[PDB]
Amino acid sequence: PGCLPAYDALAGQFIEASSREARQAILKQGQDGLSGVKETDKKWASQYLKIMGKILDQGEDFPASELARISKLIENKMSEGKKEELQRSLNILTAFRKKGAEKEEL
Numbered sequence: 001p002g003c004l005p006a007y008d009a010l011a012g013q014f015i016e017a018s019s020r021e022a023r024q025a026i027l028k029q030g031q032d033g034l035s036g037v038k039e040t041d042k043k044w045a046s047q048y049l050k051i052m053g054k055i056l057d058q059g060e061d062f063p064a065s066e067l068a069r070i071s072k073l074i075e076n077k078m079s080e081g082k083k084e085e086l087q088r089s090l091n092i093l094t095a096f097r098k099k100g101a102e103k104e105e106l
Contacts, residue, residue, distance in 0.1 A: 001087035003095065004041060006033060007048035011095040014052050015060055027052045047092050055096060063096040064104075071106045 007030055014026040030049050037045050054062045070089045078086065090106050097103065 001084060001091055002044075003091040004037075004044050004048065006030075006037075007045055008095040011048065011052070012099065015055060015096050015098055020056060023052070023056050027056075044088070044092060047089075048095075051093065051096055060096060060098050060101070063093040067093045067104065067106060074106075 010026050010030045010033075014023050017023045017026065027049060030045065030052070034042060034045055051063055051066075067090060070086050070093065074083065074086045094103070094106070
């Protein structure tokens with residue numbers, strides 16, 4: 001598993017922004033930054049941006065719920081092939097946790 005430090009930076013800038021317009025601007029930067037993202041890396045960059053689109057309205061509550069979902073799936077009877085995807089999901093979702101906030105077991 002891994003992450004996109006480029007979009008982790010954007011995630012920070014996004015979720016910590018009290019301005020909806022500022023949030024959208026940060027998302028756009030990621031959307032435009034795709035021009036410098038590898039075809040493999042785009043598989044994660046897409047997730048970052050989609051999550052941002054939801055957080056815009058829902059706040060950090062959204063990825064927080066998703067983290068709970070992914071965590072449960074890991075404990076659940078999933079096939080090995082899915083374990084990598086679940087771990088990757090946690091990293092991307094975690095990036096959208098408000099700075100300084102308590103981190104839950106994943």
